[PDB]
Design a binder for this molecule. Structure first.
Ligand code: ANP
Ligand code: ANP
Ligand code: SE4
Ligand code: SE4
Ligand code: SE4
Ligand code: SE4
Ligand code: MN
Ligand code: MN
Lengths: 302, 302
């Protein structure tokens, strides 16, 4: 593939994009700063401006940058940290349409995106900002950046964001859960893997007594889901999953207890959030199912 | 006038509007909740729903209510406090187009509004929310509510908001300042009053050594203005004033020192913010003037 080609365009492109920013002085974000999109010409020779390269000519589209500065800021992501782990350390591909990549240090993921979505996102931002500034504990994905790359005619949109499941805490059981059932078992291929990413039925089968939760924790979660749903609902959004990482242990995640009885650090985050019908009540439905499902079956009190 | 008539429609209308709310349980505010507007029919007989009255038939339009609940919440305004001081204590008129009214307890003001404006406002809200959640120390007006009343054919839009200058701290000198000069002297009529509301030139005349400020305070203000301007700018907004209340003293305001040398508690807030051209650069201009003017002439460091 022209993949390594892209991997570069990213690290070349962002480093510029962001350093570019740390010139311009800080300022609050405005309803404008969302719609904006900046481009940068990256020739294989390279101006005294866009230099370097020998990799394959492109332009680097940076999106709503002042907004994403704000978001990083609020998610506590120092630019040098961001630039480093992302740009000065080789990017590593992944099996899963939509191609993922990962930071050498397992902190950051990179989905690609249907232009359909990328545009939706832009529109979401204000809505995002609001939820973010209100449900401080939201489960929604932490969107650190949005960028497009132009490879000849071709165009690649990508989003950068928090890996929910770092190598650090090693995950034993791993589930992608929706509250639905059609094809909601992990493919033969998938099950032939490490701590492979399961699914509703596999959970339901392999874990029918549930994930037990100390009342108070069960609430924080419950309410904070019910909040995230109500957002997503409102944005006519569907197919989202709760990604869950259980870790039996023989500190930056959730405390649980077992069907047997072992203590547990669990890790979650709602995902795949950009496909938006944007029927009349259908998302409103998918939210309630997702809700009842996680907050009744997948996690339970006492 | 049919004024006392209106005074009622308000207190009758809000009390319903808000109690109406304290049923529905709390929830984060969504980009939707801004656009919404609820109405309530208030007959002079009155349903078992909208009852009471003998005052003159009307409807009570309540605006973006979940947003304004949020705002009150964030400005720390407990509904019982709000309802009481506003609805269970006679409203008091005022001289100043645009009719003001005041809470018996001097906490709240009520401007009326050109439909032109009221609509602008709605649009501002998201923008408002952002600034509010970012410049915690903004000088912008604290908008507690927006309501319209329908008196026969007639329609009255009103906004409720923080009185910047309560009876509590008695204000000695009082200025309305813009950074302009045309008609920027206080009318003969006006000067024949208590601590009458002056203006640029009167300030410039009666106070040419300025309002002195302990470095650190001068900054908090300076930066926080420069922020508010940049918002307002962005909303293509003009004719705003800085309302200033100086109090010589022989604690909820700003510390200053004098041309002579007396200690001072000063009180400010940007106002008259809804008239929006919404020329190319003109607001951007009016902001910089307003800026330089307050942060150079009206307040100065050391
Ligand atoms: N933030 C994350 N942290 C950890 N793993 C993730 C994350 N995002 C995606 N993944 C992995 O990718 C899988 C699902 O991909 P997803 O994000 O749903 O996008 P997609 O390619 O559109 N899949 P779908 O559209 O549901 O078929 C998850 O089950 C995870 O195993
Ligand atoms: N929040 C407030 N606190 C104290 N006084 C206020 C407040 N708002 C308005 N006033 C008084 O009303 C005066 C100006 O009215 P303003 O709010 O500018 O609306 P307006 O009627 O549109 N005037 P303008 O449009 O500038 O001619 C101020 O100078 C104050 O004396
Ligand atoms: O997908 Se695209 O933007 O048409 O190349
Ligand atoms: O593959 Se599916 O039907 O979205 O779970
Ligand atoms: O001012 Se209005 O709304 O036309 O009565
Ligand atoms: O009356 Se004026 O010209 O707006 O200060
Ligand atoms: Mn998907
Ligand atoms: Mn005005």
């Amino acid at each position: 593939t022209t993949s390594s080609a892209l991997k570069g365009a990213i690290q070349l492109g962002i480093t510029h994009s962001v350093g570019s920013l740390s010139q311009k002085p800080e300022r609050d974000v405005l309803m404008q700063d969302f719609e904006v999109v900046e481009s940068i010409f990256f020739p294989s020779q390279g101006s005294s401006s866009t230099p370097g390269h020998h990799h394959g000519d492109f332009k680097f589209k940076t999106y709503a940058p002042i907004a994403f500065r704000y978001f990083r800021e609020m998610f506590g992501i120092r630019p040098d940290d961001y630039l480093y782990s992302l740009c000065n350390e080789p990017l590593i591909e992944l099996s899963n349409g939509s191609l993922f990549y990962v930071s050498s240090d397992d902190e950051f993921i990179i989905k690609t995106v249907q232009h359909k979505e990328a545009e939706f996102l832009q529109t979401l931002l204000p809505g995002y900002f609001m939820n973010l500034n209100q449900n401080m504990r939201t489960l929604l994905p932490k969107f650190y950046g949005l960028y497009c790359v132009q490879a000849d005619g071709k165009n690649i949109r990508i989003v950068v964001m928090n890996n929910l499941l770092p190598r650090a805490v090693p995950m034993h059981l791993k589930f992608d859960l929706k509250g639905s059932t059609y094809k909601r078992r992990a493919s033969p291929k998938e099950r032939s893997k490490g701590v492979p990413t399961y699914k509703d039925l596999d959970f339901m089968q392999d874990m029918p007594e549930g994930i037990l939760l100390e009342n108070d924790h069960y609430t924080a979660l419950s309410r904070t889901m019910q909040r995230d749903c109500r957002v997503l609902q409102s944005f006519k959004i569907m197919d989202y999953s709760l990604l869950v990482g259980i870790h039996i242990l023989h500190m930056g995640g959730i405390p649980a207890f077992n069907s047997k009885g072992e203590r547990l650090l669990v890790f979650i985050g709602i995902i795949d959030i950009l496909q938006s019908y944007r029927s009349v009540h259908r998302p409103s439905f998918y939210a309630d199912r997702f809700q009842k499902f996680m907050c009744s079956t997948v996690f339970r009190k006492s």
